[PDB]
Design a protein around this motif. Structure first.
Motif, mmCIF file in Angstrom:
data_model
loop_
_atom_site.group_PDB
_atom_site.id
_atom_site.type_symbol
_atom_site.label_atom_id
_atom_site.label_comp_id
_atom_site.label_asym_id
_atom_site.label_seq_id
_atom_site.Cartn_x
_atom_site.Cartn_y
_atom_site.Cartn_z
ATOM 1 N N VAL A 84 0.834 -1.172 -0.101
ATOM 2 C CA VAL A 84 -0.046 -0.045 -0.013
ATOM 3 C C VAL A 84 0.960 1.254 -0.114
ATOM 4 O O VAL A 84 1.836 1.341 0.779
ATOM 5 N N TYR A 85 0.484 2.191 -0.819
ATOM 6 C CA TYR A 85 1.272 3.498 -1.128
ATOM 7 C C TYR A 85 0.320 4.579 -0.814
ATOM 8 O O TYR A 85 -0.987 4.457 -0.853
ATOM 9 N N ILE A 86 0.882 5.752 -0.198
ATOM 10 C CA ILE A 86 0.061 6.905 -0.196
ATOM 11 C C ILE A 86 0.559 8.099 -0.925
ATOM 12 O O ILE A 86 1.777 8.244 -0.818
ATOM 13 N N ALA A 87 -0.393 9.063 -1.400
ATOM 14 C CA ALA A 87 0.278 10.324 -2.212
ATOM 15 C C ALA A 87 -0.503 11.449 -1.800
ATOM 16 O O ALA A 87 -1.910 11.073 -1.632
ATOM 17 N N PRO A 88 -0.517 12.746 -1.691
ATOM 18 C CA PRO A 88 -1.359 13.740 -1.431
ATOM 19 C C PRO A 88 -2.382 13.871 -2.929
ATOM 20 O O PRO A 88 -1.593 13.607 -4.013
ATOM 21 N N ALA A 89 -3.585 14.168 -2.895
ATOM 22 C CA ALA A 89 -4.342 14.159 -3.874
ATOM 23 C C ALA A 89 -4.158 15.148 -4.790
ATOM 24 O O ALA A 89 -4.317 14.980 -6.037
ATOM 25 N N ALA A 90 -3.413 16.456 -4.392
ATOM 26 C CA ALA A 90 -3.214 17.314 -5.290
ATOM 27 C C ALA A 90 -2.167 17.019 -6.507
ATOM 28 O O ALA A 90 -2.325 17.413 -7.785
ATOM 29 N N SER A 91 -1.426 15.804 -6.303
ATOM 30 C CA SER A 91 -0.650 15.425 -7.272
ATOM 31 C C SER A 91 -1.405 14.373 -8.342
ATOM 32 O O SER A 91 -0.811 14.404 -9.479
ATOM 33 N N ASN A 92 -2.561 13.992 -8.128
ATOM 34 C CA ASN A 92 -3.114 13.037 -8.931
ATOM 35 C C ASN A 92 -2.046 11.996 -9.207
ATOM 36 O O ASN A 92 -2.378 11.269 -10.188
ATOM 37 N N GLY A 93 -1.340 11.743 -8.405
ATOM 38 C CA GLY A 93 -0.266 10.483 -8.220
ATOM 39 C C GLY A 93 0.523 10.665 -9.393
ATOM 40 O O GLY A 93 1.591 9.758 -9.397
ATOM 41 N N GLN A 94 0.935 12.006 -9.755
ATOM 42 C CA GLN A 94 2.190 12.220 -10.818
ATOM 43 C C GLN A 94 3.469 12.628 -9.923
ATOM 44 O O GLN A 94 3.400 13.253 -8.739
ATOM 45 N N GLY A 95 4.556 12.353 -10.542
ATOM 46 C CA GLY A 95 5.638 12.858 -9.935
ATOM 47 C C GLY A 95 6.236 12.025 -8.860
ATOM 48 O O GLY A 95 5.487 10.698 -8.814
ATOM 49 N N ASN A 96 7.236 12.418 -8.019
ATOM 50 C CA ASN A 96 7.808 11.562 -7.064
ATOM 51 C C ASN A 96 7.109 11.595 -5.772
ATOM 52 O O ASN A 96 7.678 12.134 -4.556
ATOM 53 N N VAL A 97 5.854 11.178 -5.803
ATOM 54 C CA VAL A 97 4.869 11.423 -4.402
ATOM 55 C C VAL A 97 4.620 10.182 -3.772
ATOM 56 O O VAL A 97 3.972 10.406 -2.633
ATOM 57 N N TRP A 98 4.925 8.903 -3.985
ATOM 58 C CA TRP A 98 4.006 7.628 -3.465
ATOM 59 C C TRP A 98 4.925 7.103 -2.363
ATOM 60 O O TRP A 98 6.049 6.623 -2.801
ATOM 61 N N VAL A 99 4.624 7.047 -1.339
ATOM 62 C CA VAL A 99 5.212 6.720 -0.084
ATOM 63 C C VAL A 99 4.813 5.281 0.398
ATOM 64 O O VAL A 99 3.332 5.180 0.540
ATOM 65 N N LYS A 100 5.437 4.253 0.899
ATOM 66 C CA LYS A 100 5.091 2.904 1.033
ATOM 67 C C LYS A 100 4.524 3.113 2.504
ATOM 68 O O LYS A 100 5.708 3.225 3.353
ATOM 69 N N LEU A 101 3.463 2.578 2.715
ATOM 70 C CA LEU A 101 2.914 2.323 4.095
ATOM 71 C C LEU A 101 2.879 1.071 4.502
ATOM 72 O O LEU A 101 2.704 0.431 5.721
ATOM 73 N N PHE A 102 3.047 -0.237 3.578
ATOM 74 C CA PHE A 102 2.760 -1.558 4.065
ATOM 75 C C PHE A 102 3.353 -2.583 2.987
ATOM 76 O O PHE A 102 3.222 -2.115 1.919
ATOM 77 N N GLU A 103 4.225 -3.598 3.337
ATOM 78 C CA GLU A 103 4.672 -4.599 2.473
ATOM 79 C C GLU A 103 4.306 -5.728 2.995
ATOM 80 O O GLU A 103 4.759 -6.255 4.350
ATOM 81 N N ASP A 104 4.083 -6.702 2.166
ATOM 82 C CA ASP A 104 3.995 -8.110 2.672
ATOM 83 C C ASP A 104 4.193 -9.177 1.563
ATOM 84 O O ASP A 104 3.525 -8.983 0.579
ATOM 85 N N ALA A 105 5.348 -9.791 1.524
ATOM 86 C CA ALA A 105 5.388 -10.930 0.384
ATOM 87 C C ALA A 105 5.327 -12.353 0.694
ATOM 88 O O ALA A 105 4.290 -12.841 0.385
ATOM 89 N N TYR A 106 6.150 -12.917 1.440
ATOM 90 C CA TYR A 106 5.952 -14.381 1.708
ATOM 91 C C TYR A 106 6.421 -14.506 3.109
ATOM 92 O O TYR A 106 7.469 -13.957 3.702
ATOM 93 N N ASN A 107 5.622 -15.274 3.857
ATOM 94 C CA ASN A 107 5.778 -15.670 5.413
ATOM 95 C C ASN A 107 6.258 -17.049 5.470
ATOM 96 O O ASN A 107 5.589 -18.113 5.133
#
Ligand SMILES: *[C@@H]1O[C@H](CO)[C@@H](O)[C@H](O)[C@H]1NC(C)=O
Ligand SMILES: [Cu+2]
Length: 235
Positions: A84-107
């Motif tokens: 899961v990533y987050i970015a401010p809405a003003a970006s419309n997800g363009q540019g260097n904006v996506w910050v990772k809040l969560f990662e799960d791969a293999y348990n």
């Protein structure tokens, strides 16, 4: 092949979000082209009329489904990681904006991929809303199915890693902005053919050897889990 139905906040269902607070595509087809603008928020990225109100420290749960709500969720063949990533809405997800809040791969303990545990969770996975600036945000949930990821799409367009990408419009109301949002990565742009975790052979390579695509999870995150928070069948 999977889509987001809606979200829950603190274990409370916010209602069907499709084309309302989720920037829904028209069907559950994957995105495969790493350079495509479709990597940002899938193939129909536009402002939808609602944004779900939350506060910092709330639990935000995405709920996925295949064909109908609370079905098989996603084909069991689609082993892979969830982010899961987050970015401010003003970006419309363009540019260097996506910050990772969560990662799960293999348990390794349970010998299960994130996708396997998503099915068991009735499509539900969560993050805890960080202490960022109050305002409007996009939360980008991303499932990568690896069953044809031995090939690269750029080389063979009938194979490749499959991305199931959903953007939710979220408004953060109460937050002390004590962990202001740090720089982000671009989508498209962060994932390339050489990025760890994009080309992988789940049939021959031990799952314990899998490394998910960077970026790493932000130290400011509080996220979060793959686990059922609510029973859709009671509604
Ligand atoms: C992948 O996306 C890029 C950027 O939009 C585009 O130029 C290229 O034609 C796409 N590839 C295919 C096979 O459609
Ligand atoms: Cu599929």
């Amino acid at each position: 092949h999977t889509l987001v139905w809606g979200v829950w906040v603190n274990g409370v269902d916010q209602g069907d979000g499709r084309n309302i607070y989720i920037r829904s595509p028209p069907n559950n087809n994957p995105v495969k082209n790493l350079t495509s603008p479709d990597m940002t928020c899938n193939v129909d990225n536009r402002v939808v009329p609602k944004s779900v109100p939350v506060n910092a420290g709330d639990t935000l749960t995405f709920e996925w489904y295949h064909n109908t709500r609370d079905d098989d969720i996603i084909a069991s063949s689609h082993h892979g990681p969830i982010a899961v990533y987050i970015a401010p809405a003003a970006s419309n997800g363009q540019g260097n904006v996506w910050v990772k809040l969560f990662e799960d791969a293999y348990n390794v303990t349970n010998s299960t991929w994130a996708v396997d545990r998503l099915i068991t969770a009735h499509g539900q996975h969560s993050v805890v809303v960080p202490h960022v600036a109050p305002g409007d945000y996009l939360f980008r949930a991303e499932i990568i199915a690896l069953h044809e990821a031995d090939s690269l799409y750029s080389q063979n367009p009938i194979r490749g890693a499959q991305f199931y990408i959903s953007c939710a419009q979220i408004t953060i109301n109460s937050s002390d902005d004590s962990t202001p949002l740090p720089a982000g990565v671009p989508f498209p742009g962060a994932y390339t053919d050489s990025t760890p975790g994009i080309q992988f052979n789940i049939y021959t390579t031990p799952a314990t050897s899998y490394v998910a695509p960077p970026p790493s999870v932000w130290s400011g995150a509080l996220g979060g889990s793959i686990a059922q928070v609510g029973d859709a069948s009671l509604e």
